[PDB]
């Protein structure tokens, strides 16, 4: 439903677009509350096939 608007040519804000992903929006907001903007080794541990990538 959000991608329909993007196809009409409407510009969607980053956070308006994040609200249409509620489960990721929540975890992303908590990472902001904690204040750690780093990332990548969490991915390399949860998915070891990405290690070094």
């Amino acid at each position: 439903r959000l991608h329909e608007r993007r196809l009409r040519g409407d510009v969607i804000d980053e956070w308006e677009e994040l609200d249409y992903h509620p489960l990721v929006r929540d975890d992303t907001y908590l990472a902001i509350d904690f204040g750690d903007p780093t990332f990548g080794r969490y991915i390399w541990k949860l998915f070891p096939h990405t290690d070094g990538d």
Partner: protein, 486 residues
């Protein structure tokens, strides 16, 4: 408003408050009279830094198996303890002055800040349910996710150091425990128990007149057998000491206790002889007990529990995680050390275990009503009032958390609990659509506790096997089957 609505009943509430205080005093007198003769002494112990006390449920949360008390009476006890906690703003005018009445007004504004006497309901269960549905579920629902995040980031650590801090074998269980709000699939409690792999092996050293001995399942089985045989003490102590020396020889062949080769713990060797005190080749000085013969090995009655929690320990949690755990469990948290909040958490834990024991004495979960079970699960913090689950689902949830709290570990308990408090809000009105399937239903049989589960390898998760598919499942589940069919 609610201020005048509660002021109208403020005269009628003092009598009920004093009656509740009298009941609390009588109940605490009885309980302490029982506790001071049946319970052991859990000594106070200080943290690694040796400045503040630390607390663990294995030592401090004692369960009076044989407590002649009704479950509703114990609920009254705990609820009135919380009411005593909530009565604290009455001291504000007696320390600030006549202008310390505005804090009392703020106290009287919200009914959730208030004790039982200001409620119109009568039964303790309905009263607790009203308080929860009005104030407590909402307060918990705004601490749950941020506590889950703090637990995650406590395991994995800060600033991109997961390759240095996390373990690669607990990975899939970690994902299933912390990211099941993405999939919508149920969780297995054994996958939360796998989080203890971050810690070491929890040990129990029995102190004897010669040396300490590590407790094992075999020695515990023998001691339970001897205790069940109901023999004379002259035979009981003899058999106990026989098993004790047997286990001593067993561990001496194993290479000593596990504590000798663990960083942070250790058993000293024989003391050294310094300088001229050294008598040639004998550089050591054995203790006095070396003179005692090994056949006289007797248990001193003293025990040392060692959780060996290197990553899970409540000391290393921090100023924030403890406060948020106490918020999530609706305990007092403000303006206190983590040791005092730890003790509050351990007391809540002990209360829940005693309540579980009394429920098992009263005939399990099925003997309870629907509202009573709802209130129990609210106390355990696994249900929110905007769910409306079934009875079988509620019973299975209770069984899950009961077994998980039997292990005596708050970190995994909170990890389990916080998974049931990840709710979203949609930006649209039409979406989410009305579902077509019925509500989720379960049973006590669906919970697999009587079977071990190996940790799934990373990026190789395995499907969930029902307990019924195991061999002899109709035999193993026969107790639950009889309880459910009856």
């Amino acid at each position: 408003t609610a201020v005048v609505k509660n002021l109208a009943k403020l005269p009628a509430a003092t009598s009920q408050i004093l009656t509740n205080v009298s009941k609390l005093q009588t109940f605490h007198g009885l309980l302490e009279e029982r506790r001071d003769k049946y319970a052991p002494l859990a000594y106070h112990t200080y943290d690694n830094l040796k400045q503040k006390t630390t607390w663990h449920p294995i030592a401090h949360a004692w369960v009076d198996e044989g407590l002649p008390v009704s479950k509703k009476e114990y609920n009254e006890y705990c609820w009135l303890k919380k009411d005593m906690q909530r009565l604290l703003p009455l001291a504000s005018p007696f320390v600030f002055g006549i202008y310390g009445i505005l804090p009392l007004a703020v106290w009287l504004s919200n009914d959730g800040y208030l004790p039982s006497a200001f409620s119109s309901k009568k039964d303790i269960v309905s009263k607790k349910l009203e308080w929860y549905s009005s104030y407590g579920d909402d307060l918990r629902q705004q601490v749950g996710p941020m506590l889950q995040h703090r637990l995650k980031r406590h395991l994995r650590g800060t600033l991109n150091n997961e390759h240095r801090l996390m373990l690669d074998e607990v990975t899939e269980s970690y994902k299933e425990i912390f990211y099941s709000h993405y999939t919508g699939q149920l969780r297995d409690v054994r996958k939360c128990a796998h989080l203890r792999l971050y810690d070491g092996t929890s040990t129990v050293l029995l102190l004897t007149n010669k040396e300490p001995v590590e407790l094992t399942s075999e020695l515990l089985q023998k001691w339970n057998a001897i205790k069940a045989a109901k023999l004379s003490p002259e035979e009981e102590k003899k058999a106990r000491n026989e098993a004790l020396i047997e286990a001593y020889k067993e561990q001496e062949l194993h290479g000593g206790p596990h504590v000798k080769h663990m960083q942070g713990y250790g058993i000293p060797a024989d003391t050294p002889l310094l300088g001229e005190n050294a008598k040639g080749d004998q550089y050591t000085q054995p203790p006095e007990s070396a003179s005692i013969p090994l056949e006289q090995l007797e248990w001193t009655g003293d025990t040392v529990f060692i959780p060996a929690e290197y990553r899970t320990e409540m000391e290393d949690w921090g100023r924030e995680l403890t406060k948020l755990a106490n918020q999530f469990l609706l305990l007092p948290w403000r303006f206190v050390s983590n040791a005092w909040n730890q003790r509050r958490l351990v007391s809540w834990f002990e209360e829940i275990l005693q309540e579980d024991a009394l429920i098992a004495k009263e005939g399990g979960v099925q003997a309870l009503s629907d509202d009573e079970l709802k209130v129990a699960l609210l106390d355990r913090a696994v249900i929110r009032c905007d769910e409306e689950l079934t009875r079988g689902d509620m019973e299975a949830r209770y069984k899950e958390i009961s077994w998980l709290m039997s292990l005596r570990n708050p970190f995994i308990v909170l990890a389990w609990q916080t998974g049931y408090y990840r709710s979203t809000y949609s930006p649209e009105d039409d979406l989410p659509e009305a579902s077509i399937l019925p509500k989720l239903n379960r049973t006590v049989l669906d919970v697999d506790v009587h079977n071990e589960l190996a940790p799934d390898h990373p990026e190789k998760p395995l499907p969930r096997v029902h307990p019924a598919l195991y061999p002899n499942s109709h035999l193993a589940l026969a107790k639950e089957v009889a309880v459910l069919a009856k």
